[PDB]
């Protein structure tokens, strides 16, 4: 009965193996651009002024 | 016949390894080395939501970044008002064992569950003025570990029977079930797209599912021990998984391997909760070492220590607007930090 | 403060309700129950698909008893929920080494290093009947002694004691015949002993 | 030696030479040991825990007041600080002893409740804090009468800054000093006996750590008794002698006054011997050290 | 489901005393603060008193203090002493829960008629009757003497509607939100002092009189009552 789950596992592996992959450097650059593009909208890395901070 | 199938599986795994290695031209560290480090980041205990009388296990921020719901072993799920520390509701749990919490995007429903094998959906805007159970979802043979709402109608729950399922609160039946995991599925995080999610199991692997098709689209490996937390990057193309080996990695969906590893020699306790910031530059990860570290997500170095709890932190939550972060420790004290 | 006064009043009311609930529930004593399958947990539950909670009251103490043996998953990932338990009740079936391994695993866990484990031996009469025909070396090959109840039971006691390593915990072994009603009194006395030991610990004197 | 009048009462007091040759060495030793103990205790620092903290605070205040006593002793009975300093010094000492003794007996009562009657309701932090505040207030209220007294007074080549004078009138202080041993001794003995009986009758006496706990809970009462009995029995001797023979003669009283002061030093050294209750009692504090 | 019934009216001679009982059924009345609102036979609504959950606080109107008493088994009571000539009115029992995001004054009682034989905040309604036809758009505006924009930013302006022969029901609370059970046609606006409830695609069942409330501080004051008649 092991053949059933063996076939399931191997078909899952072969289905996953066909997923297209892009270059790692390009993905890292895109993530860097996204992180840099929202640096001014993050009130954690830049200390929010007490005028706009609701947790006074 | 089984030997041939095992050999084919081994060949497929070797092909996966070769494909993953072939795409790794460089590393994230030597690309981010050109960026100015954030430097020291200091934040103070703005609020302290006193009132709990037991260990706090979860805290999910509402979609309006004001309502926070927390459950404890006392059997109560109090929905706080973070701005003025007011307590709005006190949900009476049927059983004191609770291990998860959730908040509806519209704020109507609050989900809870635990060792009782049952995920309960509460209603906050009932006409009678009191909170009533809308549906007691059952069908899991193991403890529910983390539950999240895709919307007001459907919930996805990660249980302890190596199976994650997509429920239907309207009918109370498993619309779609995701299977394939080996160990306990102790974490879950729906993507901002909400068409896909991940579930970091106890087998030191996080699998990326698809909500609609219900198939394991991609898989990840590399961790040494159990995975206790997971959360997507705000861009939706990456996620960070916190293992129990005192290290948390940042996987990439497109790359299909870990990009940067977050380890340091003075850390020995395993992660308990890991969540990004709004812009994704920081990685506020809770620890079992009495502390709560925040790391630079790019330079992979510490930027500050949020040591303010007298016990291990069991949850971490960042508001949707990024204005505050909440850590719920086992000292019955929930604190809001900015 | 236009209508936030009413919100503060509601917050105060529910805070008082939570305080009253906590005070009421603080008088109960929780005892986690473990053991093998069909190891005598059910008979002692009767004497007094998820987690099963049993509560019985004796001498003005609300004893809460949890049989978590129905959790068909990894014990490591949820054992931290019962970290604040007063005592751990262990049940061993003498009618048949799995229980020994389970006791060894549960005794040295990081979350149970300071909680004393009460060990209850069930089916004493059945074991005494079986030992009259089958030597104790069948179950435990390392045994070497007379084939009688008195020394075989002591040997089992000694081997169960030998599995502990922490010197800050004690094992209150008692033997039950699966039909006596004195188990509740034994449990109450053991709980009182553990409670006063913890109280002496809190004063920095024990 | 001589005689003096005060408080409308033939009131007799001496100044001998052994005092300066006996008291200050043991005084300095007790002071240094007690400061070295209580400074670390306070730095490293529940109902029992807060009671022990309050006892440590009272000990620290007493040992801060003590070097003023050393200065008084070395000057051959000459207080030059003035009226207020002498009044506040007497007030503070008396308050510190009273607080130390009363918090010791409160700690013993807490142990008695936490050993023989574990399920009693008394077994919050706010209630303990308000109880400690009420005890401090009642101590201040009972010791306030010393502040109204006038001191120093000048006879001969000295000023006197004394409250423990061999003096005919029956001051309320004397009754307070008698009571602070009469009642706490009974409470301590009753609590200790009940704790020992309960722990022995529960069969739990086979543990070695239980035996160590028994030895410590006994030695605390032993040190209390051995450090407080001689002072009160000398008080009884003074009362009987003033009684069996009035104050007609003070010639014989010099030796008993010297004994009075050298045994009043036992209270200061009992204060200095606090670390037995704290450190050796539980292994946690050696681990912290 | 929820239903509020009250009784205890009738003809009363002057100088007498009566008891009005508000019976609540179908909801957790223990955690709600029941108000009390009267209506003159030919004028607008007026306030009486308010009792919170657990009777923590109780307030009365200017000409009601001392004469009346409000107390609350799921039953609310109002004690009456020395009824004046103008005390005759129709009395409404109003339920309201107060928390962040709640909907105060959401439901109103049936109402019982009764017959007999300067520093507070005041709000005025510029118009009283405005003819309107179905399918058009109608705008009703009321002004306040004191700005209602509180510190937290929430403006406490409520809009009430009663159809002829019916008890009033909540339409818009806090001048921006919409009460449950109210169609999307109604919409509020305004800020600070000026307010306006805009109605788009008017229906034939929306005719009646509109009353605007403030909740900045007791006593609560009502508008003069803008009546939107057909044609
Ligand atoms: C000379 O010594 C004193 O008078 C002090 C007495 C005391 O308060 O203990």
C20: three-class secondary structure by DSSP:
helix
- Tell me the Cα Rg of chain A: 23
H or E element: which one contains C46?
helix C41-47
Rounded-to-integer distance, Cα A23 and Cα D93, Å = 81
Q: How was this structure determined?
A: cryo-EM
Which residue in B197, B213, B214, B297 sits closest to B253, CA to CA?
B197
Which residue range is the domain that position B233 belongs to? 1-338
Residues 6+ apart with CB under 8 A from B265: none
Residue in chain C lying closest to E156 (CA): C2
> What token pair was written down for C73?
């998953």
Rounded-to-integer distance, Cα E196 and Cα E208, Å = 16
Residues 6+ apart with CB under 8 A from D265: D23, D26, D27, D30
**Beta-bridge partners for E211:** E160
Q: Do residues D99 and D58 make contact, with C-beta atoms less than 8 angstroms apart?
A: yes
Length of chain D: 289
- Closest Cα in chain A, distance from residue B252 (Å): 8
| Record: contact B129-E99, CB cut-off 8 A | no
Query: What CATH architecture does domain C26-198 belong to?
Result: 3-Layer(aba) Sandwich (3.40)
Cis peptide upstream of residue D152 (ω within 30 degrees of 0): yes
> What token pair was written down for E107?
């439901």
Determine whether the shortest distance from the Cβ of D86 to ligand 1 is under 6 A.
no
**Beta-bridge partners for B284:** B275, B294
Task: Fill in the DSSP letter of residue B188.
Answer: -
How many of the other CB atoms lie within 10 Å of CB of B240? 27
Here the contacts of E41-44 (C-beta below 8 Å, separation 24 or greater) are E41/E88, E41/E89, E41/E90, E43/E225, E44/E209, E44/E211, E44/E222, E44/E223, E44/E224, E44/E225
Helices D208-245 and D83-116: crossing angle in degrees, nearest 10, is: 140
The separation between the first and the last C-alpha atoms of chain E, rounded to the nearest angstrom, is: 36
Rounded-to-integer distance, Cα B238 and Cα A31, Å = 8
Q: What is the 3-state secondary structure (H, E, C) of E203-224?
A: CHHHCEEEEEEECCCCCCCCCC
Rounded-to-integer distance, Cα B299 and Cα C146, Å = 71
Torsion region of E152: left, alpha or beta (phi above 0 gives left; psi -120 to 50 gives alpha): alpha
Sign of CA dihedral C95, C96, C100, C102: negative
Domain E123-229 has CATH 2.60.40.10: yes
Ligand 1 centroid–CA D164 distance in Å is 6
Residue located nearest, by CA, to atom 9 of ligand 1: D93
Rounded-to-integer distance, Cα E129 and Cα E135, Å = 18
Within this chain, domains E3-116 and E123-229 share the same CATH topology: yes
| Burial of residue A22 (number of CB atoms within 10 Å: 0-12, 13-18, 19+) | middle
Domains of chain A: total: 1
How many of the other CB atoms lie within 10 Å of CB of B81? 20
- Closest Cα in chain B, distance from residue C20 (Å): 11
E225: three-class secondary structure by DSSP:
coil
Please state the domain extents for chain C: 26-198
CB nearest C18 (choices: B84, B86, B90): B90
Which residue range is the domain that position D86 belongs to? 5-288
Write the CATH number for D142: 1.20.1070.10
Distances (CA, A) of B231 to B191, B239, D92, E205: 8, 6, 62, 51
- Closest Cα in chain A, distance from residue B293 (Å): 14
Strands E177-178 and E157-162: unpaired
| Record: contact C6-E52, CB cut-off 8 A | yes
Write the CATH number for B143: 2.130.10.10
| Burial of residue B180 (number of CB atoms within 10 Å: 0-12, 13-18, 19+) | middle
Domain E3-116 has CATH 2.60.40.10: yes
Rounded-to-integer distance, Cα D175 and Cα D170, Å = 8
Q: In degrees rounded to 5, what are phi and psi of residue D215?
A: -60, -40
Resolution value, angstrom units: 3.8
| Record: contact B86-E32, CB cut-off 8 A | no
Q: Do residues B123 and B108 make contact, with C-beta atoms less than 8 angstroms apart?
A: yes
Q: Which residues of E58-72 are buried (b: 16+ CB within 10 A; e: fewer)?
A: ebbbeebeebbbbeb
H or E element: which one contains E50?
strand E45-51
Sign of CA dihedral B153, B158, B160, B163: positive
| Burial of residue D99 (number of CB atoms within 10 Å: 0-12, 13-18, 19+) | buried
Cis peptide upstream of residue C182 (ω within 30 degrees of 0): no
Mark which residues 3-62 of C lie under 8 Å from E by CB. 3-7, 9-10, 13
> What token pair was written down for E223?
């508008």
Q: Do residues A36 and B271 make contact, with C-beta atoms less than 8 angstroms apart?
A: no
Q: Which residue from D174, D264, D272 has its CB within 8 A of the most atoms of ligand 1, so it is best to mutate?
A: D264
Rounded-to-integer distance, Cα C48 and Cα C56, Å = 6
DSSP D232-273: HHHHHHHHHHHHHH-SS--TTHHHHHHHHHHHHHHHHHHHHT
Residue carrying structure tokens 């009365």: E60
Rounded-to-integer distance, Cα B245 and Cα B264, Å = 11
Strands B334-337 and B325-329: antiparallel
Q: What is the 3-state secondary structure (H, E, C) of C123-173?
A: CHHHHHHHHCCCCCCCCCCCCCCCCCHHHHHHHHHHHHHCCCCCCCCCECC
Rounded-to-integer distance, Cα E40 and Cα E67, Å = 18
E99: three-class secondary structure by DSSP:
coil
Residue carrying structure tokens 């296990």: B57
Q: Do residues D59 and D101 make contact, with C-beta atoms less than 8 angstroms apart?
A: no
Rounded-to-integer distance, Cα B240 and Cα B222, Å = 13
Rounded-to-integer distance, Cα C5 and Cα E149, Å = 17
| Record: contact A16-B218, CB cut-off 8 A | yes
Determine whether the shortest distance from the Cβ of D19 to ligand 1 is under 6 A.
no
CB nearest C2 (choices: E99, E100, E150): E150
Residue carrying structure tokens 């028994």: D214
Here the contacts of B193-196 (C-beta below 8 Å, separation 24 or greater) are B193/B236, B194/B150, B194/B151
Rounded-to-integer distance, Cα A17 and Cα A2, Å = 22
> What token pair was written down for B319?
């508001």
B122: three-class secondary structure by DSSP:
strand
Residue in chain C lying closest to B228 (CA): C77
| Record: contact C78-B90, CB cut-off 8 A | no
What is the arrangement of strands in the sheet containing E194-199, beginning at the earlier edge strand? Answer: E123-125, E138-144, E194-199, E186-191
Q: Do residues C193 and C201 make contact, with C-beta atoms less than 8 angstroms apart?
A: no
Which residue range is the domain that position A39 belongs to? 3-55
Rounded-to-integer distance, Cα C105 and Cα C163, Å = 9
| Burial of residue E230 (number of CB atoms within 10 Å: 0-12, 13-18, 19+) | exposed
- Which residues of chain E does C20 touch, with a Cβ-Cβ cutoff of 8 Å? none
Rounded-to-integer distance, Cα D238 and Cα D231, Å = 11
Chains B, C: CB pairs < 8 Å: 71
Half-sphere exposure at residue C143, Cβ-oriented, CA atoms within 13 angstroms: 22
């Amino acid at each position: 009965a092991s053949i059933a789950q063996a076939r399931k596992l191997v078909e899952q592996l072969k289905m996953e193996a066909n997923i297209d992959r892009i270059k790692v450097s390009k993905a890292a650059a895109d993530l860097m651009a996204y992180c840099e593009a929202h640096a001014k909208e993050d009130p954690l890395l830049t200390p929010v002024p007490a005028s706009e901070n609701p947790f006074r | 016949e089984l030997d041939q199938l095992r050999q084919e599986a081994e060949q497929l795994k070797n092909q996966i390894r070769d494909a993953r290695k072939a795409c790794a031209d460089a590393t994230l560290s030597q690309i981010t080395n050109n960026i100015d480090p954030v430097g020291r980041i200091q934040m103070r205990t703005r609020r302290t939501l006193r009132g709990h009388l037991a260990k706090i296990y979860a805290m999910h921020w509402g979609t309006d970044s004001r309502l926070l719901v927390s459950a404890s072993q006392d059997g109560k799920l109090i929905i706080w008002d973070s701005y003025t520390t007011n307590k709005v509701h006190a949900i009476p749990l049927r059983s004191s064992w609770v291990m998860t919490c959730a908040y509806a995007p519209s704020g109507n429903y609050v989900a809870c569950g635990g060792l009782d094998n049952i995920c309960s959906i509460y209603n906050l805007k009932t006409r009678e003025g009191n909170v009533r159970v809308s549906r007691e979802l059952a069908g899991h043979t193991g403890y529910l570990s983390c539950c999240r709402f895709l919307d007001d109608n459907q919930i996805v729950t990660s249980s302890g029977d190596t199976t994650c399922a997509l429920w239907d609160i309207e009918t109370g039946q498993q619309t779609t079930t995701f299977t394939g995991h080996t160990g306990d599925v102790m974490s879950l995080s729906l993507a901002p797209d909400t068409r896909l999610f991940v579930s970091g199991a106890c087998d030191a692997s996080a699998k990326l599912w698809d909500v609609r098709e219900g198939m394991c689209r991609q898989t990840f490996t590399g961790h040494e021990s159990d995975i206790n937390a997971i959360c997507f990057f705000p861009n939706g193309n990456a996620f960070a998984t916190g293992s129990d080996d005192a290290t948390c990695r940042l996987f990439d969906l497109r790359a299909d391997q870990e990009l940067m590893t977050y380890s340091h020699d003075n850390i020995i306790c395993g992660i308990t909760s890991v969540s990004f910031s709004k812009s994704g530059r920081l990685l506020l990860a809770g620890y079992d070492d009495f502390n709560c570290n925040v790391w630079d997500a790019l330079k992979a170095d510490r930027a500050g220590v949020l040591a303010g709890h007298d016990n291990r932190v069991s949850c971490l939550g960042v508001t949707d607007d990024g204005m505050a972060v909440a850590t719920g420790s086992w000292d019955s004290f929930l604190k809001i930090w900015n | 403060s236009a209508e936030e006064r009413a919100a503060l009043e509601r917050s105060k009311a529910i805070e008082k309700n939570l305080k009253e609930d906590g005070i009421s529930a603080a008088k109960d004593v929780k005892l986690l129950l473990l053991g093998a399958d069909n190891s005598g947990k059910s008979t002692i539950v009767k004497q007094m698909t998820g987690i099963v909670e049993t509560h019985f009251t004796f001498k003005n103490l609300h004893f809460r008893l949890f049989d978590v043996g129905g959790q068909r998953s990894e014990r490591k990932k949820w054992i931290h929920c019962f970290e604040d338990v007063t005592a751990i009740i262990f049940c061993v079936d003498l009618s048949d080494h799995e229980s020994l391994m389970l006791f060894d695993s549960i005794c040295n866990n990081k979350f149970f290093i300071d909680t004393s484990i009460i060990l209850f031996l069930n089916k004493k009469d059945l074991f005494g009947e079986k030992i009259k025909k089958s030597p104790l070396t069948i179950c435990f090959p390392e045994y070497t002694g007379p084939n009688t109840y008195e020394d075989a039971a002591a040997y089992i006691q000694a081997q169960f004691e030998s599995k502990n390593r922490s010197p800050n915990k004690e094992i209150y072994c008692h033997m039950t015949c699966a039909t006596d009603t004195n188990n509740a009194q034994v449990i109450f006395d053991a709980v009182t002993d553990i409670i006063i030991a913890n109280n002496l610990r809190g004063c920095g004197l024990y | 030696d001589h005689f003096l009048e005060i408080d409308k009462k033939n009131c007799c007091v001496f100044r001998d030479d052994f005092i300066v040759k006996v008291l200050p060495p043991v005084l300095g030793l007790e002071f240094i040991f007690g400061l070295l103990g209580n400074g670390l205790a306070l730095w490293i620092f529940k109902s029992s825990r807060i009671f022990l903290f309050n006892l440590a605070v009272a000990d620290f205040l007493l040992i801060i007041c003590l070097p003023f006593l050393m200065d008084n002793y070395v000057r051959r009975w000459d207080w030059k600080f003035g009226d207020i300093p002498c009044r506040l010094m007497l007030f503070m000492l008396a308050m510190n002893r009273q607080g130390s003794i009363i918090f010791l007996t409160v700690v013993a009562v807490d142990r008695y409740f936490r050993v023989v009657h574990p399920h009693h309701a008394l077994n919050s932090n706010r209630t303990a804090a308000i109880i400690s505040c009420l005890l401090w207030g009642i101590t201040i209220g009972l010791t306030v009468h010393l502040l109204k007294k006038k001191m120093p007074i000048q006879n001969g080549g000295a000023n006197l800054c004394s409250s423990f004078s061999i003096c005919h009138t029956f001051q309320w202080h004397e009754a307070m000093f008698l009571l602070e041993f009469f009642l706490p001794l009974g409470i301590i003995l009753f609590c200790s006996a009940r704790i020992i009986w309960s722990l022995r009758q529960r069969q739990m006496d086979r543990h070695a750590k239980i035996k160590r706990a028994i030895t410590f809970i006994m030695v605390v009462a032993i040190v209390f008794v051995i450090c407080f009995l001689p002072s009160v029995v000398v008080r009884i001797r003074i009362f009987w002698l003033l009684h069996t023979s009035g104050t007609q003669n003070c010639e014989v009283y010099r030796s008993v006054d010297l004994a009075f002061f050298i045994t009043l030093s036992f209270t200061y050294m009992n204060s200095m011997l606090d670390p037995v209750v704290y450190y050796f009692s539980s292994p946690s504090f050696p681990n912290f050290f | 489901d929820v239903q509020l019934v009250e009784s205890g009216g009738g003809l009363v001679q002057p100088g007498g005393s009566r008891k009005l009982s508000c019976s609540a059924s179908g909801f957790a009345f223990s955690s709600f603060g029941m108000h009390w609102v009267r209506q003159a036979p030919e004028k607008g609504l007026e306030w009486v008193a308010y009792i919170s959950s657990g009777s923590g606080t109780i307030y009365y109107a200017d000409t009601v203090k001392g004469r009346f008493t409000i107390s609350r088994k799921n039953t609310l009571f109002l004690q009456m002493t020395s009824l004046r000539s103008e005390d005759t009115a129709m009395y409404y029992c109003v339920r309201s829960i107060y928390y962040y995001g709640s909907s105060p004054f959401d439901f109103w009682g049936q109402g019982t008629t009764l017959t007999v034989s300067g520093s507070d905040i005041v709000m005025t309604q510029a118009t009283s009757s405005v003819p309107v036809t179905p399918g058009e758009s109608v705008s009703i505006s009321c002004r306040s003497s004191k700005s209602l924009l509180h510190s937290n930013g929430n403006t406490y302006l409520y809009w009430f509607l009663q159809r002829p022969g019916q008890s009033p029901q909540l339409l818009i609370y806090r001048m921006s939100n919409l009460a449950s059970g109210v169609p999307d046609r109604f919409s509020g606006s305004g800020s600070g002092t000026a307010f306006t409830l805009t109605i788009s695609r008017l229906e034939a069942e929306d005719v009646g009189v509109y009353y605007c409330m403030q909740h900045l501080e007791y006593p609560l004051t009502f508008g003069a009552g803008t009546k939107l008649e057909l044609k």
